[PDB]
Amino acid sequence: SGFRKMAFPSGKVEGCMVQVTCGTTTLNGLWLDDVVYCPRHVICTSEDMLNPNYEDLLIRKSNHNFLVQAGNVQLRVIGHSMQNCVLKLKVDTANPKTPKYKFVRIQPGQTFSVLACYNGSPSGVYQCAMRPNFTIKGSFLNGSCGSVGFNIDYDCVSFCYMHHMELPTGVHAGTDLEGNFYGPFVDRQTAQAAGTDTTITVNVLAWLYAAVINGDRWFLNRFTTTLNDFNLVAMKYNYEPLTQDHVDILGPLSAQTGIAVLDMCASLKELLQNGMNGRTILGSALLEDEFTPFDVVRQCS
Amino acid sequence: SGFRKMAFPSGKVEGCMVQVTCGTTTLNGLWLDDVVYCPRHVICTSEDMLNPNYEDLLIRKSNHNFLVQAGNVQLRVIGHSMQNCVLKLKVDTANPKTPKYKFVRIQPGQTFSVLACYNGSPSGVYQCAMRPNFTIKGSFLNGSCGSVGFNIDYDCVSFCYMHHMELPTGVHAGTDLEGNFYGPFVDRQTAQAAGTDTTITVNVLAWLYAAVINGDRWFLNRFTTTLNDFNLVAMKYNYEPLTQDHVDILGPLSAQTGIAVLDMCASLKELLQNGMNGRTILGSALLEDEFTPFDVVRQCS
Numbered sequence: 374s375g376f377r378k379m380a381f382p383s384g385k386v387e388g389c390m391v392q393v394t395c396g397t398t399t400l401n402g403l404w405l406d407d408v409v410y411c412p413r414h415v416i417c418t419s420e421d422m423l424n425p426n427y428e429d430l431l432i433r434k435s436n437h438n439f440l441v442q443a444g445n446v447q448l449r450v451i452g453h454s455m456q457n458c459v460l461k462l463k464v465d466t467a468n469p470k471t472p473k474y475k476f477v478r479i480q481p482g483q484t485f486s487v488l489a490c491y492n493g494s495p496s497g498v499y500q501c502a503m504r505p506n507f508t509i510k511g512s513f514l515n516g517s518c519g520s521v522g523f524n525i526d527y528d529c530v531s532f533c534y535m536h537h538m539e540l541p542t543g544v545h546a547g548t549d550l551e552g553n554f555y556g557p558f559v560d561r562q563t564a565q566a567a568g569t570d571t572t573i574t575v576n577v578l579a580w581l582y583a584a585v586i587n588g589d590r591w592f593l594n595r596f597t598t599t600l601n602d603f604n605l606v607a608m609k610y611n612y613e614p615l616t617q618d619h620v621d622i623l624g625p626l627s628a629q630t631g632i633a634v635l636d637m638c639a640s641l642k643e644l645l646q647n648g649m650n651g652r653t654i655l656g657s658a659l660l661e662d663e664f665t666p667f668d669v670v671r672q673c674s
Numbered sequence: 675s676g677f678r679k680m681a682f683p684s685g686k687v688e689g690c691m692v693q694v695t696c697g698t699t700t701l702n703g704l705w706l707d708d709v710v711y712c713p714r715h716v717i718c719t720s721e722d723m724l725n726p727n728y729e730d731l732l733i734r735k736s737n738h739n740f741l742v743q744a745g746n747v748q749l750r751v752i753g754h755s756m757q758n759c760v761l762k763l764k765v766d767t768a769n770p771k772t773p774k775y776k777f778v779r780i781q782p783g784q785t786f787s788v789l790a791c792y793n794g795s796p797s798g799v800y801q802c803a804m805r806p807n808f809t810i811k812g813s814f815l816n817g818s819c820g821s822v823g824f825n826i827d828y829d830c831v832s833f834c835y836m837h838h839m840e841l842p843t844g845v846h847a848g849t850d851l852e853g854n855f856y857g858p859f860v861d862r863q864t865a866q867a868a869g870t871d872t873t874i875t876v877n878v879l880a881w882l883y884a885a886v887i888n889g890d891r892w893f894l895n896r897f898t899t900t901l902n903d904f905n906l907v908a909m910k911y912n913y914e915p916l917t918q919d920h921v922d923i924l925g926p927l928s929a930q931t932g933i934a935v936l937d938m939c940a941s942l943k944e945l946l947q948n949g950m951n952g953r954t955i956l957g958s959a960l961l962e963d964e965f966t967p968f969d970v971v972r973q974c975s
């Protein structure tokens with residue numbers, strides 16, 4: 374038993390982490406097959422980030438202006454293009470540690486594991502979720518740009534995130550592996566702000582379902598509610614409207630615990646309305662919303 | 675910026691995770707050089723765990739009774755011995771993915787990263803700390819025995835934990851890599867109980883120091899205190915007595931933030947005496963004690 378914030382094993386991705394330098398800037402790259410992926414703001418200076426015309430800056434860059442390093446082996450670049458907000462550096466030698474992988478754009482509320490990197494070397498790994506306002510609450514210091522977020526489906530590595538920005542509000546923003554930012558963020562140093570961060574309601578319910586299987590049951594009450602009436606309370610506390618799809622995904626958890634998803638929403642309703650009285654659930658004194666319904670069945674099975 | 679519960683990259687240890695089967699029981703092993711390490715309760719049945727005479731059970735086991743598997747390559751065992759509560763299975767072929775490593779017995783309060791494993795395959799990775807009562811609060815389902823806890827010092831892998839037991843109270847107990855249990859626990863299914871779990875006071879202070887560098891400062895007050903007077907309050911709330919050594923280890927954090935460690939203990943004193951008023955610190959609604967003073971400088975640098 375036991376329940377803990379878990380991240381996928383990062384070994385498959387450590388073999389793809391290289392260091393990319395362009396002029397004076399250094400960041401991390403992702404080395405799959407004979408291409409290296411990295412944020413396109415590597416071709417920028419600190420003054421450039423004020424307002425960078427990225428195409429004009431790329432006019433000045435040649436193939437030898439990109440120093441890709443994989444430890445003590447230097448990669449030779451033989452082609453470079455700009456796909457949205459990433460740079461596709463084509464190299465002459467394919468990565469021998471390339472795993473089975475796809476490029477996936479995850480949905481809001483979904484989770485992924487992040488491998489924090491600096492100068493192409495892995496530093497740590499932690500679990501992260503895409504907030505409804507398309508930001509993430511991570512750990513990213515200077516030089517962490519190019520670090521990736523991924524999911525591991527048995528053999529496949531579903532890359533979904535690449536770090537680009539830290540907003541002046543403390544949170545982080547980034548793109549998928551095709552270069553498209555998550556949310557209305559640009560790779561430019563300006564005054565950007567994410568929306569009102571809401572809570573992934575379907576994720577809170579799955580976390581409460583994990584608490585029942587572990588022994589934490591004090592929050593179980595004797596009430597029920599309706600999907601509409603629970604959405605009125607959810608909307609009041611800045612929670613995501615719970616849909617019928619969310620109800621179905623919680624099906625296996627509802628069947629295994631014997632607690633209907635509407636009874637669980639009634640217990641969550643009272644937690645939102647009465648707080649926690651100073652108690653904890655699964656070692657947390659607040660409601661955790663960074664475990665998907667699949668994350669709970671992954672650890673409980 | 676940002677602060678998150680981080681674990682070391684697990685790739686170096688995934689290359690050492692094999693599957694060990696003895697008769698009907700299956701668990702995980704650790705493959706370094708030409709030896710495989712695993713819990714000695716692999717030679718036990720479910721009835722045996724009631725009260726197992728381990729030496730007598732090992733009399734009946736031969737070298738071929740140990741099936742070590744590393745994916746689709748079977749390892750040939752040519753020697754087996756019992757070191758305390760682990761089994762040293764000597765194999766004829768050395769692990770090519772062996773990293774630089776030592777066997778370390780960590781102190782109470784220290785942290786390490788755990789790679790959860792089942793049938794020799796890695797499942798996830800999470801950060802864990804050795805509680806003062808020598809238990810850990812982890813995620814361990816059936817078949818997770820043999821999973822390891824480790825620290826990565828640049829190149830070296832400091833293995834420190836191997837999982838053995840889940841106590842009837844929900845927590846987990848295990849041994850170092852030399853076979854000695856952490857705490858007064860035996861590898862037998864009986865009524866074992868850890869002591870009164872206290873809080874790693876030096877770790878809470880380092881976490882509060884990390885909060886200052888990130889923007890969370892509301893808990894900063896205008897008080898100071900003495901080491902003795904703070905220990906009276908700490909002892910009341912089941913906290914670890916803070917020593918002068920703890921004060922020195924917090925030195926770099928105290929100097930970088932400009933806040934003396936006794937002023938920080940005064941702020942922590944009021945949090946223990948006034949609670950949190952419903953606020954949070956670094957996204958947590960309670961006091962986190964599973965970040966060492968070195969874990970904070972590791973992420974902030």
Ligand SMILES: [Au+]
Binds near residue numbers: 515516
């Ligand atoms: Au960066």
Ligand SMILES: [Au+]
Binds near residue numbers: 473474475528529
């Ligand atoms: Au695939």
Ligand SMILES: [Au+]
Binds near residue numbers: 701816817818819820
């Ligand atoms: Au086990």
Ligand SMILES: [Au+]
Binds near residue numbers: 774776830831
């Ligand atoms: Au070493």
